[PDB]
């Protein structure tokens, strides 16, 4: 009967599905439902997510198709272990994450259906690995506003929750809402598999063709030698100047690494082969 | 290793001296942990009839020794002068006189409480205020600073009030003898039967009162926990029971604690695990550590695991580089 | 330790009660005989009077730094068995 600083675990599969689905229909403002799982009031988890079919209505409650969800749930029960649908996600491409009247109506409907009905908001605003614009919201009824909003009983997690603070538009519509802490679900096997993926796939680590390297190197070193020779004037003047109450140029770590690697290539050249 | 041998050699040298100064004789008991040795020297003093030194060394060790072996010392002493010796090496008459000293002298300012009150924020810092007032008169049994206003405890969520009643208990620390009736005065049924939060807080306060103070309160709390709800109340009750039986190593409480841990409950299980760790304080009992570590990775709750963390940490301690196997296992 | 852990839980704060040992210096001659000793601090109260080098008092709010400076009042018939270098429960004879 009291809220707290709860947490939602998101499986890597879940966030990947959410982001790809959102990018799929950015102009269309796509939406869907998740298949989450209950552990306790403090924490709740989500593992799988499916895409509700495109509908011209938008994020309307009617957009949910009972036959579609029933069929998907039955199929999942047949193959693997499904779980009850925690809530809904949608992409609000406008600016960051927030909610609207229709969104709050849908959330209220689900809250009538279940307990948390957590809402998820994504956007096309993304970075290569540095945006995660996703966010999670949950509504507050207007009956208990006399009572405390979110009874807090932990300083560390409450402060961590406040660290994201609230977005400009979020304050513009923060009422009837209270964001809930999100975190990536523990990931080891998936983490290890991805880490192996990077070396060979997401960046040049084939390790068999890993070793121009003697064609253009002469020219690159020529450019950098000329540039350093030029830059050497500024330290000259700086030293020339007296006490009087742009020498820092580095440009040497790059040459160091490049040509030391090129020289080391002799190890492949003379021994590894032949 | 060198420490024990040098200590025993030097204490032998000392008692070989004409006057076995009990101050330097306490090294065996407090550093070399020779409860039998301290018992024997106390017996020699008793037959020598110098009760002055007897209770001097008794108080010295009592205020500068761990109960785990004081129990053995008392056992050896037991099997008049003997009765007085047992009393002083008994349920903390030193604590009684300390609390008498504390109540006899207090310097507390109401204006600080008032400055907190008028600066009320209508937010979580209610709990911070109640705990601060608890710290103010810890063991003073002077709640009038709070008895004056009955709204600071009437304007909190059912959960913070648990902390408030725990603070009330903390203010009243050391009476022991009357603690039963004193807590009953604010008994959960008397205060708020519907607030099971206060129900658990009552047991938590009762446990806090007898901090390290062994007695029948341990068995009483054991029975209460046995006949009570598994989750809604058991958190505070189990926590207090574990605290009151700290380091007692008794199996009759260990069984209940392990059952609670194995009741796969989150709201109270973390307190259960904290108590489990507390009771097995520095025992190095491999059975307990293996049980707790195995159960840690076996469940799927954070709160349970967060509590079990400190529980394990407190299980085995004071061994320097002795439990390194466990350290490495947990570190990796 | 429990206090440090209280960042993830508030109710645990009360545990600091266990970590509270007052600096009062307790003195008793007989089993219960309260003594009328008044050690002379031989220093300015200043620190003592927290809201003329001397001090008197049973145990009082005397701190280890002030305890080390306290002077044992031999003028009285009974005296402590062990010195009064640092506080605690020093019995008298």
Ordered DSSP codes for B127-181: HHHHHHHHHHTTTT---HHHHT-SSTTSSS-TTHHHHHHHHHHHHS-S--TTHHH
- Cα C17 from Cα C1, distance rounded (Å): 12
Signed CA dihedral, B331, C2, C5, C8: sign only? positive
Range of the domain at A230: 206-267
Closest by CA to B330, choosing from B318, B311, B313, B306, is B313
* Whether residues A24 and A146 fall in one domain: yes
Instruction: For an interface test with A, give the residue of B121, B297, B302 to mutate (most A CBs within 10 A).
Output: B302
Query: For the sheet containing A43-50, what is the strand order?
Result: A135-137, A119-122, A88-91, A31-38, A43-50, A7-10, A181-184
Q: What are phi and psi of A23, to 5 degrees?
A: -65, -25
- Same domain for A220 and A96, yes or no, is no
* Partners of residue C24 in chain B, C-beta under 8 Å: 98, 101-102, 105
For residues B270 and B304, is the Cβ–Cβ distance under 8 A?
A: yes
| Residue in the structure block whose two tokens are 């601090």 | C41
CA-nearest residue to B156 within chain A is A148
* φ, ψ for residue A176, nearest 5 deg: 55, 20
- How big is chain B by its Cα radius of gyration, in Å? 23
Residues A216 and A129 in one domain: no
Residue B211 backbone phi and psi in degrees, to 5: -60, 115
Q: Are residues A87 and A106 in the same domain?
A: yes
Cβ contact (<8 Å) for A154 and C9?
yes
Q: Please, which experimental method was used?
A: cryo-EM
Residue of B120, B36, B111 whose CA lies nearest to B76? B36
Residues of C in Cβ contact (< 8 Å) with B55: 31, 91
Does residue A273 belong to any structural domain of this protein? no
Which of A144, A175, A195 delimits the end of a domain?
Answer: A195
Is B90 within 8 Å of B83 (Cβ atoms)? no
H or E segment to which residue B188 belongs = helix B188-191
Tokens, residue A198? 């990077």
DSSP string for chain A? ----S-EEEE-HHHHHHHHHHHHHTGGGT-EEEEEEEE--SSEEEEEEEE-PPP-TT-S-GGGS-HHHHHHHHHHHHHSS-------EEEE--SSSS---HHHHHHHHHHHHHSS---EEEE-S---SSS----EEE-B--SSSTTS-SS----HHHHHHHHTT---HHHHHT-TTB---EEEE---SHHHHHHHHHIIIIISS--SSS---TTTTHHHHHHHHHHHHHHHTHHHHHHHHS----------SHHHHHHHHHHHHTHHIIIII--
The vertex-C15 CA angle with C9 and C17, nearest 5°, equals 145
Hey, which residues does C71 pair with through a beta bridge?
A: C40
Q: Report CB contact under 8 Å: B163, C14.
A: yes
A60 within a domain of the structure (yes/no): yes
In this complex, is the C-beta atom of B109 within 8 Å of any C-beta atom belonging to chain C?
yes
Within-domain flag for A1: no
CA A78 to CA B58: how far, in whole Å?
73
Residue of A65, A7, A6, A8 whose CA lies nearest to A31 = A65
The CA distance from C90 to C27, in Å, is 5
How many domains is chain A partitioned into structurally?
2
The DSSP result for B12-42, as a single string, is HHHHHSSS--HHHHHHHHHTS--HHHHHHHH
**Domain end point (choices A138, A168, A195):** A195
Q: Assess whether A90 and A40 both reside in one domain.
A: yes
Question: Is C56 an interface residue toward B (CB < 8 Å)?
Answer: no
CB B31 within 8 A of CB B7: yes
Q: Do C14 and B84 touch (CB under 8 A)?
A: no
Closest CA to C27 of C17, C18, C37, C19: C37
Cα angle for residues B103, B106, B109 (degrees, 5° grid): 140
Q: What is the resolution of this structure in A?
A: 3.3
DSSP conformation class of B326? H
**What phi and psi values does residue A91 have, to the nearest 5 degrees?**
-105, 120
Residue corresponding to tokens 């009328």:
C36
| Cβ neighbours of A104 (radius 10 Å) | 16
Breaks (C-N over 2.5 A) in chain A follow: 211, 245
Q: Is A2 a domain residue?
A: no
Q: Note whether A230 and A176 are same-domain residues.
A: no
- Are A12 and A109 members of one domain? yes
Q: Are A104 and A87 in contact (CB under 8 A)?
A: no
d(CA B81, CA B93): 16
Judge whether B207 and B239 are in contact, CB under 8 Å. yes
Helix H or strand E segment including C91: strand C89-91
Cβ(B184)–Cβ(B190) under 8 Å? yes
Q: Are the CB atoms for C73 and C37 separated by under 8 Å?
A: yes
- Distance CA(C16)–CA(B327), nearest Å, equals 26
Residue B207's H or E segment, with its range, is helix B196-209
Q: How far apart are CA B296 and CA B270, in angstroms?
A: 11
């Amino acid at each position: 009967a009291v809220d707290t600083a709860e947490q939602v675990y998101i499986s890597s599969l879940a966030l990947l599905k959410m982001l790809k689905h959102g990018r799929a229909g950015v102009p269309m403002e796509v939406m869907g439902l998740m298949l989450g799982e209950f552990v306790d009031d403090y924490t709740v988890r989500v593992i799988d997510v499916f895409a509700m079919p495109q509908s011209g209505t938008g994020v309307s409650v009617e957009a949910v198709d009972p036959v579609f969800q029933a069929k998907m749930l039955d199929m999942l029960k047949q193959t693997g272990r499904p779980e009850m649908v925690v809530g809904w996600y949608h992409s609000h491409p406008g600016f960051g994450c927030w909610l609207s009247g229709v969104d709050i109506n849908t959330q209220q409907s689900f809250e009538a259906l279940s307990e948390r009905a957590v809402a998820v908001v994504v956007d096309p605003i993304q970075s290569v690995k540095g945006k995660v614009v996703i966010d999670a919201f949950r509504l507050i009824n207007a009956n208990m506003m006399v009572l405390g909003h979110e009874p807090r009983q932990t300083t560390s997690n409450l402060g961590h929750l406040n660290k994201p603070s609230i977005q400009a538009l979020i304050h513009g519509l923060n009422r009837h809402y209270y964001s809930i802490t999100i975190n990536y679900r523990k990931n080891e096997l998936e983490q290890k598999m991805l880490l192996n993926l990077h070396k060979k796939s997401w960046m040049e680590g084939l390790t068999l063709q890993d070793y121009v390297v003697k064609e253009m190197l002469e020219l690159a070193k020529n450019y950098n030698k000329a540039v350093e020779e030029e830059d050497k004037m500024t330290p000259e003047q700086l030293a020339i100047k007296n006490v009087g109450k742009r020498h820092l140029e580095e440009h040497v770590d790059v040459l160091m690494t490049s040509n030391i690697v090129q020289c080391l290539a002799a190890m492949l050249d003379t021994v590894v082969f032949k | 290793q060198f420490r024990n041998k040098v200590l025993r050699v030097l204490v032998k040298i000392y008692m070989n001296l004409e006057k076995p100064d009990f101050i330097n004789v306490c090294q065996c008991l407090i550093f070399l942990d020779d409860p039998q040795a301290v018992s024997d020297i106390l017996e020699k003093l008793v037959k020598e009839d110098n009760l002055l030194m007897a209770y001097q060394i008794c108080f010295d060790l009592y205020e500068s020794a761990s109960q785990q072996f004081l129990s053995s010392v008392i056992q050896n002493l037991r099997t008049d002068q003997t009765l007085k010796m047992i009393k002083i090496l008994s349920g903390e008459m030193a604590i009684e006189l300390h609390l008498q000293f504390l109540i006899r002298n207090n310097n507390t300012d109401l204006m600080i409480l008032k400055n907190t009150k008028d600066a009320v924020r209508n937010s979580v810092c209610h709990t911070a205020t109640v705990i601060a007032n608890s710290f103010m008169h810890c063991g003073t049994t002077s709640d009038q600073f709070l008895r004056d206003n009955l709204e600071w405890l009437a304007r909190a969520t059912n959960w913070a009030k648990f902390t408030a009643t725990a603070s009330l208990g903390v203010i009243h620390k050391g009476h022991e003898k009357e603690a039963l009736q004193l807590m009953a005065t604010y008994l959960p049924k008397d205060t708020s039967p519907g607030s099971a939060y206060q129900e658990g807080g009552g047991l938590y306060a009762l446990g806090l009162i007898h901090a390290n103070h062994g007695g029948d309160i341990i068995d009483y709390l054991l029975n209460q926990l046995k006949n009570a709800s598994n989750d809604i109340v058991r958190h505070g009750g189990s926590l207090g029971l574990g605290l009151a039986a700290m380091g007692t190593a008794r199996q009759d409480v260990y069984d209940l604690l392990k059952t609670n841990l194995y009741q796969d409950d989150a709201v109270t299980g973390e307190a259960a695990g904290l108590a489990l760790g507390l009771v097995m304080l520095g025992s190095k009992n491999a059975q307990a550590i293996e049980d707790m570590v195995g159960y840690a990775q076996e469940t799927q709750h954070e709160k349970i695991l967060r509590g079990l963390a400190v529980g394990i940490a407190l299980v085995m301690y004071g061994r320097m580089e002795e439990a390194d196997a466990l350290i490495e296992s947990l570190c990796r | 330790l429990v206090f440090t852990q209280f960042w993830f839980w508030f109710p645990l704060s009360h545990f600091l009660s266990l970590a509270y040992t007052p600096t009062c210096v307790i003195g008793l001659n007989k089993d219960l005989k309260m003594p009328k000793v008044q050690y002379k601090s031989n220093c300015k109260p200043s620190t003592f009077a927290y809201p003329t080098a001397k001090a008197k008092k049973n145990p009082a709010r005397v701190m280890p730094a002030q305890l080390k400076v306290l002077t044992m009042p031999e003028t009285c018939r009974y005296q402590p068995f062990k010195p009064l270098s640092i506080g605690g429960i020093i019995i008298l004879k």
